[PDB]
Amino acid sequence: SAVKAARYGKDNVRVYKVHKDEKTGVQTVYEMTVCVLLEGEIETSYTKADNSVIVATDSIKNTIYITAKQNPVTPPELFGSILGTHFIEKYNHIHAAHVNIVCHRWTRMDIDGKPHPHSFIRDSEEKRNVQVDVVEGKGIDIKSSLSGLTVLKSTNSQFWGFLRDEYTTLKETWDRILSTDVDATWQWKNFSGLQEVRSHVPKFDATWATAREVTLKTFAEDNSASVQATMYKMAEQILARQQLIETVEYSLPNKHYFEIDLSWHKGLQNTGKNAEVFAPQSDPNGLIKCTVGRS
Amino acid sequence: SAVKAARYGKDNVRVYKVHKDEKTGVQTVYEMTVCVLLEGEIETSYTKADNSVIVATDSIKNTIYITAKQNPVTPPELFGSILGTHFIEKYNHIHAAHVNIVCHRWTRMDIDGKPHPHSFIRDSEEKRNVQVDVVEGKGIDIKSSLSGLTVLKSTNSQFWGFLRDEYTTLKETWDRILSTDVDATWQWKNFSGLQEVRSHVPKFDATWATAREVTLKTFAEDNSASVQATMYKMAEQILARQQLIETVEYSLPNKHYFEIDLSWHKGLQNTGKNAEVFAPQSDPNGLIKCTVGRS
Amino acid sequence: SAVKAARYGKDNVRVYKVHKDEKTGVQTVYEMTVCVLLEGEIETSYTKADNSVIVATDSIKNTIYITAKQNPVTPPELFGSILGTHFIEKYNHIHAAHVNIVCHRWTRMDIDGKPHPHSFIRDSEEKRNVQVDVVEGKGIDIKSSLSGLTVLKSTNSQFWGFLRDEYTTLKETWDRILSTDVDATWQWKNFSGLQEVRSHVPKFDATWATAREVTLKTFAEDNSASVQATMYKMAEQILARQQLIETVEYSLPNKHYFEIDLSWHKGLQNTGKNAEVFAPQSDPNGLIKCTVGRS
Amino acid sequence: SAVKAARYGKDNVRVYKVHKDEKTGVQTVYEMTVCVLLEGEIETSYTKADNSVIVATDSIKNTIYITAKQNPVTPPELFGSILGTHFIEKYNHIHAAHVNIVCHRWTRMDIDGKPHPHSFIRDSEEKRNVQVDVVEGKGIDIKSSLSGLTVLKSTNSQFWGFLRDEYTTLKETWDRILSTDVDATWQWKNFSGLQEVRSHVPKFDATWATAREVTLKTFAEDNSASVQATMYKMAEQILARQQLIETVEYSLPNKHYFEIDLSWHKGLQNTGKNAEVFAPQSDPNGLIKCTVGRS
Ligand SMILES: O=c1[nH]c(=O)c2nn[nH]c2[nH]1
Ligand SMILES: O=c1[nH]c(=O)c2nn[nH]c2[nH]1
Ligand SMILES: O=c1[nH]c(=O)c2nn[nH]c2[nH]1
Ligand SMILES: O=c1[nH]c(=O)c2nn[nH]c2[nH]1
Ligand SMILES: [Ar]
Ligand SMILES: [Ar]
Ligand SMILES: [Ar]
Ligand SMILES: [Ar]
Ligand SMILES: [Ar]
Ligand SMILES: [Ar]
Ligand SMILES: [Ar]
Numbered sequence A, B, C, D: 001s002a003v004k005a006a007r008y009g010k011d012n013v014r015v016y017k018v019h020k021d022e023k024t025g026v027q028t029v030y031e032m033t034v035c036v037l038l039e040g041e042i043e044t045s046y047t048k049a050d051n052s053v054i055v056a057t058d059s060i061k062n063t064i065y066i067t068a069k070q071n072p073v074t075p076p077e078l079f080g081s082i083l084g085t086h087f088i089e090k091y092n093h094i095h096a097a098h099v100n101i102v103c104h105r106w107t108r109m110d111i112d113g114k115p116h117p118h119s120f121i122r123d124s125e126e127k128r129n130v131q132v133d134v135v136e137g138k139g140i141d142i143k144s145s146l147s148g149l150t151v152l153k154s155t156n157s158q159f160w161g162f163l164r165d166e167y168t169t170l171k172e173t174w175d176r177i178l179s180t181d182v183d184a185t186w187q188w189k190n191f192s193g194l195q196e197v198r199s200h201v202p203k204f205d206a207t208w209a210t211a212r213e214v215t216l217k218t219f220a221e222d223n224s225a226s227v228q229a230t231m232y233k234m235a236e237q238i239l240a241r242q243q244l245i246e247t248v249e250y251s252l253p254n255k256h257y258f259e260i261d262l263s264w265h266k267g268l269q270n271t272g273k274n275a276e277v278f279a280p281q282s283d284p285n286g287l288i289k290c291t292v293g294r295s
């Protein structure tokens, strides 16, 4: 046998960091879950019980904590880059670092009108994430995303004119519910190293903000021909609003809500135009993915 | 043997309902998970295979759906009452109905400044719930609650002067993080029936709003002596702001965040006054409950 | 206001312990999640910021770990008792200790026929649990249970002759699937203290074994008239097989599996006697509880 | 813009099927969760609101159910192939079908010694899975796996001689606990179509059985130099026992259990050779992956 591929490291490192403006007295907190996996000349640790090549997962956990103390942890794209550059610059036999960051929401609380200086609320389970791959002599590839953004519109969603054969039972509809959890990824042009990443830093928040803003607006205003048609509109708006983005990716569940025929009981009318009460369906669910780049 | 207690019914009924103002064109959606358990003279179904006494769980699922079409599903306290009264008035041998409702958030989206007429976002996993027990010849007891409200303050939390013996290793602190998920219950005075419930309807939202408002403010403004001291302050503020509430209950995890000594590495300083990076601890967690009523 | 009820302590303490027979070289591992909540004269910690009355949750976490080192952690009923007695005997102002233990399965692996001396497998997510309430001057109440025991029979389950009214749509069936997760609790006679608990120790495993054995057999052999009828049979068999048990409790979901009419497509026959393919329904689910004691 | 990649279909289709030997009266049940995603000339559904190209996700749900009635659902590798071939042979514009199956355990119950003819138990949350990609004019690629297989050995695991620098705090150990959840994938040689898949059918169970048997034995008998060294041994044993397997993949968390220094309290000794009580750590966790093919 032989080692064809190998990576190893530390998953699920929970990390908190506070910033104290000792002038204003305003505190900002950040919270993330971090994973770092390394590659390189580490095959012997697998084939020959040679641990001499292993930076211990424990130590990678140390490094995450250390790097966070020594550097800003915002924006995620930058922290990832700094963390991954460390591993490949520090160790000769380590040739790639793979850094996934999941960011958790701590939104400043508004109390009696006023933004409060050090109290926070998890106002969603929506996440901002990054995948940052730092390969030696290749640069830094960054996939940014927002995920777990759960939305529902009660009308202005259609689905008609799909293929009908002897497998088809679904009725054409000109008015349905559409609900999804948004998973959106945008992939940056290759950067050459930390310097280039640092030169674009303001763009990372900007593009994230844009992605979320477009997602929410297109969803609410579009008279959806299908999930397919609506997600493509979002994607092409994002690509047009930031040229450092090479591709845009959406994975979207169709979280169906079924009409309930209630007419067997007192001729009660609750379908079509009369539909008021709906059965949310835990499963199964439609799943729709698309990758959109420039023509 | 003999049947000492028995209840049965349907759990986890997912329910959606839209309201369309066909004037304005504004739609409001509601989503909940419903459980109804019945009691009465149903022992024979257990001891003698006598199914004649059983309203089928399936049918209870029907009734939930039906009741929702025939009535408003807001406020939860009212829907519960209507649903539970149905069972005990309809069936002679059914003497109590137990109705738990969990309400899901669908907050209207703000698009380009403007409230959108039919698009919604799950802007938290926080729930509003009710437990409504309708017992025949006894009235309607209602426990309302908010839950899953996750908060964190970065300072203005203390814990010193606790008992110290040969089991104690915890250091006194005059500045720590405090994070919790809020579970708050307030118990209404017994109501006599649907009429009395209907006469107070506006109070149910009001009190909920109050509970959440007090919870968030007391948490942010209080220089916490302990979780114990801070939750009692919330409870007594709620009791004072609504006389139809008999008791107030808080269950609160203490979701610890530990300091990370980083001084073994380059004499780096990250404890006490220097603390910037923290290890959120998934487990274990402190748990603190209190029931507070009037003196 | 005033404190009506109060308890506090530590939840979700994960605990592992190995036993090494240094004779045979056979190791036995145990793993549990532990919660201890205390009561007593602790109101002032809530009303007056008086922390002097508080055994710190941290210290309760210490005590769990310590008690486990100093004592056997099997059987759960005994460990609970020892742990809870500690708190009420140690502290004057602590008058009750509430101890929930959840036990995790580590079943010895069979390798090449032979029981292996120190390798284990989680061969189910089924748990053995205890609730042990130690109240000062009142003794020790113990609720033992098994839970998360998930079963399914493909036939020999019936449900006919239930009430039919204008809410009923469910068809009578003389052959259906029955699936559930078993939650079974048996409540011991009050014990006077640790001595009495120690005098019965062998009974705790025995009764657990019995409960599981009866549960599985009655489920498999009974031609079920209903969940109601089948669970009562289990309960009365357990009560008859151990006189130190005062009551037996079952909570059981009915995890429905629906027939799929496939006759719209090539007159394919998949209902009634022809039924081969079924839709497992995540929700909603029937829920059936019973408490059975002696006549 | 333009569509770079696109797939769509139905996720989380829950499926049950019983087999009745009407001779013996022995029933066998099967339960799985199924996902089918299609590709082809479907870009217009995204760019031009052209639904004419879409086989509705609903219909794909039908097809899963239908295919299951018309064919055996065991072994998973075969069902996948049949299901995926259907889509690409049926529709001109559909050029690839992607079929993930997750299999759920229903192990026949042993009652009073005897295998019971129609009663079953979920005796683990361990799954057997397949990923079957059917691409038109390319054949059938199959990734089989077992997952969620959770194991722990109490000794005979070592970790020493890893790199030590100014990031390292972890102590070398010649005796620790090793716990993991096993995720093992083995990738078959490309098959040309359904015929070739059918010609190897007996091998699929065999290889699965082998994978699990090797996994469990190597884990229990190996004096682990590291997770790395132990997983490679498993992989090379599997490759040697089946030549139709091209590569073998392991993803493995290191689910750490920490020693508890209890010496601050009554000089109690619970470290090194004395260690009996351990803190299972929910997070973070070491993660170790390897892909092993033939030299
Ligand atoms: O928007 C939709 N896209 C689809 O592909 C689909 N299939 N069924 N329903 C659907 N709705
Ligand atoms: O606020 C707190 N209350 C407690 O009871 C406690 N115990 N440890 N830490 C604590 N913090
Ligand atoms: O066993 C059953 N008990 C019930 O109470 C019931 N209700 N619907 N189906 C049922 N099956
Ligand atoms: O088996 C192990 N492999 C590793 O790579 C490692 N790192 N810390 N501990 C470890 N144990
Ligand atoms: Ar952070
Ligand atoms: Ar969409
Ligand atoms: Ar509703
Ligand atoms: Ar609090
Ligand atoms: Ar234990
Ligand atoms: Ar049952
Ligand atoms: Ar199946």
Ligand SMILES: [Ar]
Pocket (backbone or CB within 6 Å): D180, D219, D226, D227, D230, D231, D252
């Ligand atoms: Ar391993």
Ligand code: NA
Pocket (backbone or CB within 6 Å): A087, A088, A089, A090, A091, A092, A093, A094, A095, A136
């Ligand atoms: Na390097």
Ligand code: NA
Pocket (backbone or CB within 6 Å): B087, B088, B089, B090, B091, B092, B093, B094, B095, B136
């Ligand atoms: Na009645």
Ligand code: NA
Pocket (backbone or CB within 6 Å): C087, C088, C089, C090, C091, C092, C093, C094, C095, C136
């Ligand atoms: Na006491």
Ligand code: NA
Pocket (backbone or CB within 6 Å): D087, D088, D089, D090, D091, D092, D093, D094, D095, D136
């Ligand atoms: Na095709």
